XYZ file of C-alpha atoms in Angstrom:
758
model
C -7.898 24.504 -11.385
C -11.348 24.029 -9.835
C -12.966 25.069 -6.544
C -15.056 21.961 -5.936
C -16.502 22.728 -2.500
C -16.851 25.436 0.144
C -13.368 24.521 1.403
C -11.903 22.259 -1.318
C -9.585 23.031 -4.239
C -8.139 20.903 -7.024
C -5.272 21.285 -9.520
C -4.334 19.249 -12.604
C -0.888 18.671 -14.108
C 0.238 17.661 -17.616
C 2.375 14.617 -16.733
C 2.891 12.222 -13.845
C 4.550 13.832 -10.827
C 5.637 13.164 -7.250
C 5.887 14.893 -3.878
C 7.314 14.263 -0.391
C 5.875 10.803 0.248
C 5.584 11.234 4.035
C 3.059 13.996 3.324
C 3.134 17.788 3.349
C 2.554 19.880 6.452
C 0.496 23.085 6.386
C 3.768 25.027 6.181
C 4.759 23.027 3.083
C 1.794 23.685 0.770
C 1.935 27.385 1.595
C 5.341 27.157 -0.125
C 4.177 25.509 -3.383
C 1.106 27.537 -4.399
C -0.087 31.081 -3.768
C -3.339 32.970 -4.269
C -3.369 36.451 -5.808
C -6.003 39.061 -5.125
C -7.782 39.923 -8.359
C -5.854 42.467 -10.409
C -2.615 42.414 -8.380
C 0.783 40.712 -8.448
C 1.842 40.883 -4.781
C 0.654 37.509 -3.413
C -1.323 37.105 -0.206
C 0.974 37.059 2.820
C -1.069 35.207 5.443
C -1.482 31.434 5.451
C -4.423 30.489 3.234
C -4.175 26.666 3.067
C -4.288 24.139 5.906
C -3.930 20.700 4.270
C -2.764 19.157 1.025
C -2.181 15.832 -0.703
C -1.555 14.522 -4.215
C -3.995 12.166 -5.896
C -3.018 8.618 -6.727
C -2.858 8.966 -10.528
C -0.119 11.646 -10.151
C -2.209 14.077 -12.219
C -4.457 15.804 -9.672
C -3.895 17.812 -6.503
C -6.059 18.452 -3.439
C -6.056 21.532 -1.206
C -7.968 22.862 1.801
C -8.592 26.442 2.919
C -8.336 28.136 6.302
C -11.908 29.466 6.156
C -14.834 29.026 3.799
C -14.858 30.795 0.449
C -15.783 34.476 0.753
C -18.198 36.472 -1.395
C -16.222 39.699 -0.838
C -12.545 40.542 -0.507
C -10.934 38.584 2.328
C -7.251 39.024 3.151
C -6.948 35.552 4.717
C -8.930 33.178 2.477
C -10.071 32.567 -1.081
C -12.111 35.479 -2.395
C -14.068 35.144 -5.621
C -12.067 35.894 -8.794
C -8.718 34.718 -7.390
C -5.817 33.121 -9.273
C -3.171 30.513 -8.446
C 0.541 30.408 -9.305
C 3.580 28.339 -8.350
C 5.858 30.045 -5.834
C 9.207 30.964 -7.357
C 12.151 28.702 -6.609
C 10.449 25.665 -5.071
C 11.590 22.042 -5.085
C 8.712 20.055 -3.556
C 6.882 18.943 -6.732
C 8.948 17.245 -9.444
C 8.065 15.309 -12.591
C 8.819 11.672 -13.488
C 10.902 10.503 -16.456
C 12.842 7.283 -15.628
C 16.075 9.250 -16.172
C 17.967 11.045 -13.429
C 18.260 14.593 -14.778
C 14.728 14.762 -16.235
C 12.940 15.291 -12.901
C 12.669 19.044 -13.262
C 10.801 21.022 -10.616
C 7.510 22.549 -11.737
C 8.144 26.172 -12.738
C 5.854 29.227 -12.537
C 3.587 30.120 -15.413
C 4.347 33.598 -16.809
C 0.670 34.355 -16.055
C -1.548 33.455 -13.117
C -4.453 31.030 -13.515
C -8.107 31.844 -12.862
C -9.944 29.306 -10.704
C -13.402 28.001 -11.614
C -16.211 26.692 -9.358
C -18.050 23.413 -9.891
C -21.186 21.625 -8.697
C -20.888 19.637 -5.457
C -23.739 17.125 -5.036
C -27.339 16.290 -5.935
C -30.139 14.654 -3.918
C -33.643 13.845 -5.159
C -36.239 15.198 -2.718
C -39.210 14.092 -4.859
C -39.553 11.093 -7.177
C -43.303 10.438 -7.547
C -44.511 12.254 -10.673
C -42.179 15.114 -11.691
C -38.929 14.434 -9.836
C -36.996 17.224 -8.107
C -33.213 17.405 -7.654
C -31.391 19.821 -5.332
C -27.694 20.711 -5.397
C -25.195 22.391 -3.084
C -22.980 25.084 -4.611
C -19.513 26.071 -3.336
C -20.243 29.794 -2.788
C -22.604 32.638 -3.666
C -23.716 31.988 -7.229
C -26.180 33.295 -9.789
C -28.110 31.896 -12.741
C -27.922 33.632 -16.103
C -31.152 32.131 -17.439
C -33.894 30.022 -15.872
C -34.861 28.069 -19.019
C -32.763 24.915 -18.986
C -32.565 22.404 -21.826
C -31.405 18.812 -22.137
C -28.351 19.855 -24.156
C -27.284 21.989 -21.182
C -28.216 19.830 -18.180
C -29.285 16.166 -18.138
C -30.499 13.382 -15.869
C -29.406 9.948 -17.100
C -30.299 6.469 -15.840
C -27.904 3.516 -16.070
C -26.054 4.986 -19.074
C -28.907 3.735 -21.274
C -31.696 6.354 -21.250
C -32.319 10.056 -20.632
C -35.264 11.749 -18.919
C -37.385 14.497 -20.462
C -37.751 18.040 -19.121
C -39.998 21.099 -19.236
C -39.387 23.902 -21.719
C -39.391 26.869 -19.322
C -38.919 27.283 -15.592
C -36.968 24.030 -15.297
C -34.243 25.580 -13.106
C -33.959 27.985 -10.187
C -31.503 29.456 -7.691
C -31.504 30.525 -4.047
C -28.458 32.451 -2.850
C -27.270 34.786 -0.110
C -23.928 36.160 1.056
C -22.841 32.772 2.451
C -24.080 30.073 0.069
C -26.346 29.003 -2.752
C -28.556 26.135 -3.916
C -29.803 25.118 -7.362
C -32.874 23.116 -8.389
C -33.747 21.148 -11.520
C -37.274 19.861 -12.152
C -38.333 16.992 -14.411
C -41.557 15.877 -16.088
C -41.381 12.091 -15.566
C -41.271 9.748 -12.586
C -38.119 8.030 -11.335
C -38.629 4.398 -10.408
C -37.314 3.276 -7.046
C -35.120 0.615 -8.672
C -33.461 3.204 -10.932
C -31.068 4.039 -8.072
C -30.037 0.400 -7.486
C -29.689 -1.518 -10.762
C -26.548 -0.668 -12.691
C -25.013 2.778 -12.359
C -28.001 4.660 -10.981
C -28.968 8.261 -11.666
C -26.566 11.148 -12.255
C -26.789 14.776 -13.379
C -24.658 15.687 -16.408
C -23.726 19.269 -17.286
C -23.178 18.887 -21.027
C -22.228 22.495 -21.807
C -21.852 25.925 -20.232
C -21.578 29.398 -21.727
C -21.700 33.110 -20.963
C -24.044 34.131 -23.814
C -25.566 31.041 -25.473
C -29.031 29.656 -24.719
C -28.778 25.847 -24.922
C -25.776 25.885 -22.547
C -26.290 26.396 -18.824
C -25.321 29.869 -17.594
C -24.004 29.954 -14.023
C -21.422 32.212 -12.386
C -19.743 32.896 -9.064
C -20.107 35.921 -6.845
C -23.145 38.158 -7.233
C -23.349 38.878 -10.983
C -21.948 37.947 -14.396
C -18.483 39.446 -13.821
C -17.664 36.297 -11.829
C -16.125 33.107 -13.194
C -18.018 30.596 -15.299
C -18.786 27.099 -14.045
C -17.388 23.870 -15.491
C -18.691 20.724 -17.138
C -18.931 17.516 -15.154
C -21.100 14.721 -13.815
C -22.511 14.291 -10.299
C -24.236 11.310 -8.619
C -27.853 11.529 -7.464
C -29.107 9.859 -4.277
C -32.677 9.199 -3.157
C -33.531 10.683 0.247
C -37.288 11.269 -0.099
C -38.494 7.685 0.385
C -35.181 7.028 2.013
C -33.172 4.581 -0.047
C -29.814 6.352 0.180
C -29.872 8.343 3.406
C -26.568 6.501 3.710
C -24.833 5.574 0.468
C -22.479 2.890 1.777
C -20.242 1.845 4.662
C -16.963 -0.059 4.431
C -14.608 -1.665 6.956
C -11.174 -0.105 6.433
C -9.838 -1.518 9.715
C -10.754 -3.989 12.430
C -11.692 -0.966 14.571
C -12.525 1.776 12.035
C -15.561 2.103 9.766
C -16.108 4.630 6.967
C -19.717 5.724 6.366
C -20.331 8.018 3.388
C -23.113 10.671 3.420
C -24.832 11.756 0.181
C -24.338 15.517 0.692
C -22.384 17.921 2.914
C -23.739 17.869 6.455
C -23.882 20.048 9.561
C -23.821 18.974 13.219
C -25.735 20.772 15.954
C -23.638 22.326 18.697
C -22.572 20.116 21.585
C -23.116 16.852 19.713
C -20.987 14.064 18.260
C -21.182 10.967 16.073
C -22.110 8.834 19.075
C -25.493 10.573 18.722
C -26.428 10.495 15.031
C -25.447 6.900 14.184
C -26.574 3.396 15.103
C -25.501 -0.190 14.464
C -27.087 -3.644 14.511
C -25.766 -5.306 16.621
C -25.011 -2.240 18.743
C -21.384 -1.103 18.986
C -19.736 1.574 21.108
C -18.369 4.654 19.317
C -15.291 6.166 20.959
C -13.951 8.776 18.513
C -14.572 10.415 15.151
C -12.806 12.533 12.532
C -14.507 14.709 9.906
C -12.960 15.583 6.550
C -12.754 19.136 5.176
C -16.497 19.299 4.603
C -18.753 16.756 6.347
C -19.491 14.050 3.793
C -17.293 11.212 5.112
C -17.170 10.030 8.730
C -14.560 7.652 10.149
C -15.530 6.232 13.544
C -13.514 4.236 16.069
C -15.541 1.174 17.073
C -14.841 -1.613 19.541
C -15.380 -4.417 17.020
C -16.321 -5.295 13.470
C -18.024 -8.615 12.751
C -19.895 -10.045 9.791
C -23.569 -9.200 9.434
C -23.176 -5.637 10.704
C -25.320 -2.728 9.541
C -25.639 1.017 10.125
C -28.389 3.639 10.244
C -28.952 7.245 11.286
C -30.343 7.750 14.777
C -34.024 8.595 15.113
C -33.638 11.573 17.439
C -34.372 14.706 15.357
C -32.277 17.875 15.215
C -28.981 15.954 14.975
C -27.699 15.829 11.377
C -28.807 18.229 8.654
C -28.297 18.973 4.957
C -28.853 22.285 3.194
C -31.876 22.586 0.907
C -32.142 26.385 0.564
C -29.958 29.456 1.026
C -30.138 29.391 4.843
C -32.272 26.294 5.433
C -31.452 22.837 6.772
C -33.438 19.594 6.789
C -33.035 16.405 8.790
C -32.052 12.971 7.543
C -34.472 10.092 8.078
C -33.749 6.454 8.835
C -34.001 3.614 6.335
C -36.501 0.770 6.270
C -33.609 -1.722 6.148
C -30.216 -0.727 7.511
C -27.185 -0.403 5.251
C -25.090 -3.577 5.119
C -21.433 -2.948 5.942
C -19.156 -4.415 3.278
C -15.499 -5.387 3.832
C -12.371 -4.027 2.164
C -8.628 -4.630 2.261
C -6.598 -3.090 5.082
C -2.891 -3.057 4.209
C -0.081 -4.924 2.466
C 3.635 -5.608 2.894
C 6.489 -7.555 1.307
C 7.512 -11.159 1.885
C 9.927 -11.682 -1.024
C 10.271 -10.607 -4.660
C 7.601 -12.963 -6.069
C 4.897 -12.987 -3.356
C 3.135 -10.401 -1.183
C 0.551 -10.395 1.611
C -2.589 -8.363 2.362
C -4.117 -7.822 5.816
C -7.868 -8.354 6.214
C -10.410 -7.128 8.794
C -12.508 -10.298 9.229
C -12.498 -14.008 8.461
C -13.031 -14.606 4.737
C -13.064 -17.506 2.282
C -13.483 -18.388 -1.393
C -16.377 -20.423 -2.774
C -17.080 -22.758 -5.675
C -20.025 -20.736 -6.979
C -22.502 -17.915 -6.530
C -25.392 -20.020 -5.194
C -26.396 -20.714 -1.588
C -25.050 -24.292 -1.711
C -21.416 -23.437 -2.511
C -18.455 -24.882 -0.614
C -15.148 -23.396 0.480
C -11.986 -23.563 -1.632
C -8.445 -22.824 -0.468
C -7.064 -21.429 -3.745
C -7.860 -20.287 -7.279
C -6.174 -20.559 -10.652
C -5.063 -17.258 -12.159
C -7.932 -17.295 -14.670
C -10.482 -17.295 -11.841
C -8.433 -15.137 -9.440
C -8.269 -12.501 -12.193
C -11.960 -11.771 -11.486
C -11.434 -10.716 -7.841
C -8.461 -8.349 -7.487
C -5.787 -6.551 -9.493
C -2.187 -5.588 -8.699
C -1.404 -2.144 -10.075
C 1.763 -0.420 -11.200
C 2.453 3.089 -9.955
C -0.050 5.673 -11.142
C -2.655 3.149 -12.313
C -6.171 2.848 -10.910
C -9.410 1.019 -11.635
C -12.501 2.608 -13.191
C -16.294 2.369 -12.945
C -17.219 -1.144 -14.026
C -13.852 -1.762 -15.722
C -10.369 -2.987 -14.818
C -6.962 -1.563 -15.668
C -5.730 -5.054 -16.615
C -7.689 -5.195 -19.877
C -4.429 -3.748 -21.203
C -1.833 -6.118 -19.694
C 0.908 -3.489 -19.338
C -0.950 -1.825 -16.451
C -0.839 -4.810 -14.060
C 1.643 -7.374 -12.807
C 1.317 -10.873 -14.207
C 0.286 -13.858 -12.080
C 1.803 -17.308 -11.717
C 0.382 -19.694 -14.329
C -1.553 -21.922 -11.954
C -2.789 -21.598 -8.370
C -2.142 -17.878 -7.874
C -4.628 -16.858 -5.147
C -4.351 -18.387 -1.658
C -6.424 -17.801 1.487
C -7.870 -20.044 4.176
C -8.770 -23.704 3.785
C -11.820 -25.855 3.040
C -12.936 -25.688 6.699
C -12.576 -21.994 7.581
C -11.273 -18.611 6.502
C -8.453 -16.365 7.671
C -7.377 -12.707 7.782
C -4.119 -12.919 5.777
C -4.105 -13.253 1.982
C -1.169 -14.238 -0.250
C -0.704 -13.989 -4.025
C 1.943 -15.303 -6.431
C 3.233 -12.937 -9.116
C 4.754 -13.933 -12.441
C 7.203 -11.028 -12.147
C 9.161 -9.241 -9.450
C 7.949 -6.481 -7.140
C 8.811 -2.970 -8.356
C 8.889 -0.083 -5.889
C 5.469 1.553 -6.024
C 3.128 -1.407 -6.553
C -0.446 -1.428 -5.227
C -3.304 -3.913 -4.839
C -7.083 -3.478 -4.904
C -10.410 -5.235 -5.502
C -12.413 -4.421 -8.635
C -16.110 -4.477 -9.375
C -16.497 -7.886 -11.051
C -16.422 -9.430 -7.562
C -19.598 -7.948 -6.063
C -21.316 -7.111 -9.359
C -21.281 -3.368 -8.705
C -21.758 -0.612 -11.280
C -23.090 -2.731 -14.111
C -20.404 -5.413 -13.992
C -21.125 -9.150 -13.757
C -20.565 -11.012 -10.500
C -17.736 -13.530 -10.611
C -18.446 -17.248 -10.827
C -16.196 -17.851 -7.784
C -16.490 -15.041 -5.227
C -14.715 -14.092 -2.011
C -16.842 -13.403 1.066
C -16.641 -12.423 4.726
C -18.299 -15.207 6.694
C -20.519 -17.913 5.227
C -21.588 -18.338 1.591
C -24.403 -15.762 1.953
C -22.719 -12.848 3.742
C -21.410 -9.620 2.254
C -18.904 -9.674 -0.610
C -15.706 -7.626 -0.700
C -15.840 -4.142 -2.227
C -13.202 -1.802 -3.721
C -11.481 0.756 -1.535
C -11.239 4.448 -2.365
C -7.507 4.330 -3.196
C -5.123 1.456 -3.978
C -2.920 0.009 -1.248
C 0.700 1.145 -0.957
C 2.551 -2.150 -0.468
C 5.300 -1.509 2.086
C 8.830 -2.990 1.929
C 10.702 -4.598 4.814
C 13.934 -6.530 5.203
C 13.991 -10.193 4.148
C 16.732 -12.012 6.084
C 19.673 -11.267 8.378
C 22.313 -13.981 7.977
C 25.337 -12.982 10.067
C 28.826 -13.132 8.549
C 32.130 -13.104 10.286
C 32.157 -12.003 13.864
C 31.470 -8.277 13.570
C 29.340 -8.010 10.413
C 25.691 -8.704 9.750
C 24.182 -8.783 6.257
C 20.504 -7.941 5.723
C 18.941 -8.781 2.367
C 16.394 -6.358 0.949
C 13.398 -7.067 -1.311
C 14.137 -4.214 -3.753
C 16.891 -1.703 -4.479
C 17.461 0.707 -1.588
C 19.832 3.290 -0.136
C 20.353 5.726 2.717
C 19.169 9.276 2.088
C 19.693 12.304 4.333
C 17.050 14.653 5.769
C 17.705 17.347 3.118
C 18.102 15.626 -0.267
C 21.605 14.161 -0.416
C 22.543 10.479 -0.580
C 24.721 9.800 2.448
C 28.231 8.737 1.435
C 29.862 8.689 4.880
C 27.260 7.443 7.402
C 29.175 8.938 10.358
C 29.393 6.967 13.601
C 26.475 8.906 15.097
C 23.918 7.958 12.424
C 24.656 4.226 12.190
C 23.472 3.515 15.738
C 19.963 4.792 14.930
C 19.269 2.682 11.833
C 18.580 -0.643 13.540
C 17.031 -1.709 16.830
C 19.247 -4.395 18.358
C 19.062 -6.303 21.664
C 19.685 -4.044 24.636
C 23.331 -3.397 25.454
C 25.163 -3.521 22.095
C 25.818 -0.398 20.032
C 26.228 -0.200 16.259
C 28.998 2.016 14.901
C 29.711 2.121 11.149
C 27.358 0.799 8.466
C 27.223 0.661 4.675
C 25.367 -0.569 1.584
C 26.328 -3.101 -1.062
C 27.504 -2.376 -4.592
C 24.370 -4.092 -5.917
C 22.147 -2.025 -3.575
C 20.596 -5.221 -2.138
C 22.252 -5.519 1.282
C 23.059 -3.463 4.365
C 26.013 -4.366 6.573
C 26.823 -3.316 10.135
C 30.230 -3.296 11.818
C 29.200 -4.008 15.403
C 31.328 -2.169 17.956
C 31.811 -5.361 20.002
C 32.078 -9.069 19.272
C 28.905 -10.707 17.966
C 27.057 -13.538 19.703
C 24.259 -15.938 18.733
C 20.735 -15.055 19.747
C 21.112 -11.398 18.798
C 18.343 -10.046 16.577
C 17.874 -7.094 14.219
C 14.783 -5.036 13.404
C 14.115 -1.671 11.800
C 13.832 1.076 14.394
C 10.528 2.927 14.649
C 10.723 6.496 13.384
C 14.213 6.225 11.886
C 15.036 9.060 9.511
C 17.590 7.853 6.939
C 17.391 4.410 5.351
C 15.009 4.462 2.380
C 14.026 2.530 -0.703
C 15.957 3.987 -3.614
C 17.899 3.455 -6.796
C 19.659 6.482 -8.253
C 18.030 5.871 -11.657
C 15.086 3.466 -11.410
C 12.819 5.322 -9.003
C 11.567 8.901 -9.374
C 11.951 10.944 -6.221
C 14.223 11.509 -3.249
C 13.985 12.132 0.503
C 11.571 14.930 -0.382
C 9.860 12.791 2.210
C 8.326 9.365 2.785
C 10.093 6.083 2.043
C 11.671 5.119 5.350
C 11.881 1.456 6.276
C 9.513 0.274 8.983
C 9.854 -2.315 11.761
C 8.977 -5.969 11.370
C 6.189 -7.534 13.401
C 8.933 -9.653 15.005
C 12.659 -9.051 15.344
C 14.378 -11.281 12.798
C 16.867 -13.750 14.242
C 20.270 -13.799 12.537
C 21.422 -17.140 11.137
C 25.058 -18.225 10.687
C 27.089 -17.953 7.484
C 30.789 -18.027 8.396
C 33.494 -20.540 9.308
C 36.800 -19.743 10.987
C 39.351 -21.846 9.070
C 40.038 -25.204 7.439
C 42.999 -27.499 6.818
C 43.871 -30.509 4.682
C 45.337 -33.514 6.502
C 45.242 -36.244 3.831
C 44.230 -36.779 0.247
C 40.764 -37.654 1.604
C 40.358 -35.836 4.937
C 39.486 -32.217 5.723
C 38.897 -30.363 9.000
C 36.504 -27.404 9.279
C 36.625 -25.333 12.478
C 33.558 -23.368 13.566
C 32.931 -20.225 15.656
C 30.048 -21.562 17.790
C 28.938 -25.085 18.778
C 26.414 -26.949 16.628
C 24.277 -30.098 16.594
C 22.755 -31.899 13.636
C 18.999 -32.032 13.174
C 16.175 -32.716 10.719
C 13.847 -30.530 8.660
C 10.622 -31.694 10.333
C 8.370 -29.161 12.045
C 10.409 -29.934 15.171
C 14.073 -30.765 14.435
C 14.814 -34.164 15.906
C 18.299 -34.739 17.330
C 22.058 -35.410 17.043
C 23.987 -38.161 15.206
C 22.422 -41.586 15.778
C 25.015 -44.374 15.669
C 28.575 -45.242 14.685
C 27.081 -47.524 12.037
C 24.457 -46.243 9.612
C 25.811 -42.783 10.435
C 24.129 -39.710 8.891
C 23.552 -41.002 5.379
C 25.290 -39.381 2.425
C 22.314 -37.118 1.718
C 22.397 -35.796 5.286
C 25.999 -34.553 5.205
C 25.437 -33.488 1.589
C 22.647 -31.246 2.894
C 24.803 -29.365 5.428
C 28.309 -28.941 3.923
C 30.246 -29.313 0.669
C 33.752 -29.317 -0.788
C 34.090 -27.362 -4.027
C 36.856 -27.439 -6.676
C 38.553 -24.181 -7.569
C 37.225 -22.539 -10.721
C 34.159 -24.804 -10.909
C 31.348 -25.603 -8.485
C 30.751 -29.306 -9.199
C 30.705 -31.044 -5.828
C 32.903 -34.013 -4.988
C 31.291 -37.286 -3.927
C 31.486 -38.077 -0.218
C 32.240 -41.641 0.814
C 29.160 -43.837 1.058
C 28.315 -45.075 4.571
C 29.661 -48.421 5.660
C 31.576 -50.340 8.304
C 33.672 -47.614 9.912
C 33.182 -45.310 6.906
C 31.238 -42.191 7.920
C 30.944 -39.276 5.455
C 30.943 -36.626 8.196
C 31.763 -36.982 11.897
C 30.674 -34.229 14.286
C 33.091 -33.848 17.183
C 31.693 -34.073 20.688
C 32.866 -30.537 21.414
C 30.746 -29.375 18.471
C 33.320 -26.969 16.996
C 34.730 -29.358 14.366
C 33.349 -31.352 11.459
C 35.499 -33.780 9.475
C 34.972 -34.669 5.821
C 36.250 -37.806 4.090
C 36.102 -37.734 0.302
C 35.713 -40.672 -2.083
C 38.902 -41.584 -3.948
C 37.094 -43.547 -6.683
C 35.773 -40.257 -8.147
C 38.201 -37.492 -7.161
C 40.745 -36.392 -4.566
C 41.886 -33.202 -2.873
C 43.409 -30.573 -5.154
C 44.908 -27.166 -4.427
C 42.578 -24.195 -4.128
C 39.621 -26.296 -2.997
C 37.020 -24.444 -0.941
C 34.584 -25.532 1.758
C 30.980 -24.339 1.575
C 27.516 -24.833 3.043
C 25.521 -27.704 1.598
C 22.250 -28.562 -0.108
C 18.860 -28.408 1.622
C 17.491 -31.926 1.214
C 17.354 -33.621 4.613
C 19.439 -31.970 7.371
C 20.428 -28.760 9.155
C 22.959 -27.406 11.655
C 21.756 -25.415 14.669
C 24.202 -23.768 17.065
C 24.066 -21.580 20.157
C 26.273 -19.903 22.734
C 27.253 -23.126 24.506
C 26.691 -26.835 24.013
C 24.347 -26.940 27.012
C 22.284 -24.065 25.573
C 21.650 -25.717 22.192
C 18.053 -26.735 21.488
C 15.906 -27.891 18.575
C 14.876 -24.270 17.832
C 18.280 -22.557 17.847
C 19.704 -20.322 15.096
C 20.673 -22.516 12.164
C 23.054 -22.480 9.216
C 21.931 -21.339 5.781
C 21.690 -23.656 2.767
C 22.025 -23.507 -1.017
C 19.503 -23.853 -3.809
C 20.740 -26.867 -5.785
C 23.156 -29.777 -5.563
C 25.670 -27.903 -7.750
C 25.005 -24.200 -7.255
C 26.731 -20.814 -7.492
C 28.513 -20.846 -4.112
C 27.559 -18.601 -1.189
C 29.005 -16.015 1.183
C 30.292 -18.849 3.408
C 32.973 -20.135 1.008
C 36.439 -20.517 2.534
C 39.704 -21.814 1.089
C 41.556 -24.879 2.364
C 45.107 -24.522 3.644
C 47.279 -27.609 3.142
C 49.335 -29.219 5.892
C 51.104 -32.389 7.032
C 49.867 -35.958 6.757
C 52.563 -37.646 8.888
C 56.291 -37.936 9.618
C 58.787 -40.780 9.933
C 62.475 -40.806 10.859
C 64.912 -42.708 8.643
C 68.126 -42.100 10.597
C 69.275 -40.328 13.787
C 69.547 -37.065 11.803
C 67.001 -37.412 8.996
C 63.223 -36.924 9.090
C-alpha cells in the first residue's frame, strides 16, 4: 500500500481481480478495507473513505479519504502510522481464474499492513545555471540527512543522460503541521528543449534507507519513528520560463475537455474555472468537476472544433501551487497556447467481427506525413497497426511501446483493408475496424504513441488527423475504452414469440448474485421497451446462450419494435464459465440508438397438391421487391415473370435429411416459378420434374439473398417499399433456418367411375 497524495491511497494485489462493474458507492468501500489506529486491533468505526475504483490492469486499487491526512491522531481520517486490512467476510473483490470455483474472495491477512507515503510531483522553478526542482509531499515529513547523492536521487533526461549534483547541501525540507515541501538543487543548466524532445526530465528515487548514507532518508510525521518513503519516478515540468504551465489538453467528448495541471492546485474562495482558463477561439464554460486533489479539470464547453487551444487567464490571484510549507505562487500564461489534441470517445458492438468507435470531430487518414498528403478512405492492416490497438482484458499500452509486440495481448486484424473511416473528399466521426477473430467480453480499444510520435516513438508514415493534413494528430487516452455490447437483430417467430440475437454469450442475473431460473411474470415486463400498449409476460434464454425470447401477452403485429430499456436491472452479459464475475455490479444491457424493427421468420402452414405444386400460406400480406437502395415493386408481367434467381432468393423447398435445394422450373410461356396471389397471403411453387419431384418429409424454407426480397405489413394497402421484410440465408445450399416448416400432403383430384364409386 502507498499514500500517494494528501487524499489519495493505492493498493496492489498479487493476481488479476474484479469488482462490481457498475462501480462502488461510498458505503461499499467502507466494507472492503479498514484502517486501524496504530497499536490497536479494534478498527475505526466512522466512515473514512469517500470514493473508490479499481485500476484497469486489475492489479491496483484507488481510494479517497474523507479529510486530508492528519499529523496527529484523528478518529475520522488517516493518521500517520496507520495500517490497512480486509474486512472479515466480504464478497466484493474476487480473483480471476477461467474456472467457476476458483474465484475466491480476497481474505484477511493474519497481520495488518503498514502504509507508506510517496512523492507527488516536481516542477522546475529555475533552469538557467543550477536548476532547482520543488516537490509536494503528502503530509508532514522530515529529512534524515541533507547531503543527497546521485545514487539516492537523480534527474535524468530522455533516458540517455544524467545530470550532476553538489556534494553537500543538495536537498532541503520545509514542513509544518499541515504539509511539507522538498527541494533538490543541481549544478548544471537544463536546456529548454530537454522538456520537449523524447521523454523529457524526471526525478528518480533510486534507493531509500533508515540508516545508510547514499540512500535518501525521508519519513512521515515529525521524526524518525514514522514510516519510510518508497522508490519511484516522477515527471518534471518547466514553469519558470513557462513551457508547461499546462501539460496537455485532450478532447474526451464533443462537449467536455480535460486539461491537466503539473502540480496540485488551490482555488481562491468564490471563484470557478470560468475565471482561470481561456480558449482561442473563445468558448463558454458552463460547469466543472475537480478530482480528489486539483490536478485534473474537466470542463463543460459549448463546442469543440479543430485548431483550438487553451491557456491560463492573466488575472492574478486565481490559481496557485504550493512552493513552501504555507506558501502559494501563481501560474503564468504561455507564449503560445497549448494545442488541444483529440482522443477517442466510446465504442460499441455491431457484430462478432467488427466494432465501431465514436469520435469528437471530423477526422481522416493521409498518404504521408508531409504537407502535400491526400486523404485515403482505408488502410491495410500493416499500416493500420501503427495507429491503434485492440486490447484484451487487463492489457494496457506503455510509454513509447505497444502491447501488441507480443501478439497474444491483442486481437488480430483482417488480412487486408482493416481500418475504415471517411472518404477521399472528407472525414467523419464514426470509425470501423475489421477483426480477424471474434469479440470476447471485456475487449478495449486505444491509440498508441507511434501515431503522434510521442515519448520517443517514431511518427507513422500514414497518420490520422482531425481536420486538414496539418492539424493536430490523435493522442492516447488515459484508460482503454470499454466496448459495450448491444443486441444484434430481432427477427420475430410465430405469433407470440420474438427472438433477439446477441453478439456474445449472455444471461439474466438477479440483484443479489443468483442467476435467475424462473423470470417471474413481474420481471419480464421490465427487460425490454416495446411500443406503447403491449405488455411482455414470460421470457427466457436459449440453450446456447445466444438468444432471448419473449412470450408476448397478446397477439403480435408487424411494425412493433424492441429496444433495451434504460436502467433495467437484470439482463447481463454472462457465461457461467467463460467470464469472471457476477452481478456484483455492472454489465447490464443498454438501449440502442434506434429501436430495432422486427423482421418476419415464420409461415403458418403448407400443403402438397401435385407432384410439382406446393402452396405456402403466410400470416401477413407481402409484396415482392428488389435489393436496390429503394426496393422497386411487385411482379412485372405474366411472361418473363420473376426470373428463377428471383424466386430462388426468397423461398426454397428442401428435401428431408439433406439441404440440397430442388430446381424450380425455368421461366417460359405460361411457366412461372413462383406466383404471388393478389391477396398476398399465398405463394405457389412449381418444381422441375426433369431433376426431381416431391417426396415425403419435404420442408419449405426462406431462400437465398441474390436478387429479391419479401416485405409485408398489416394490410395490403399499408405495404410500402420500406416495410419489414423476410430474412434470408447465407448460401444457395445452406444449413436451414428457424423458418423451416414441413409439407402436409393432400389430394390432387377426383373422378367418379360409377354411380357408387369415386
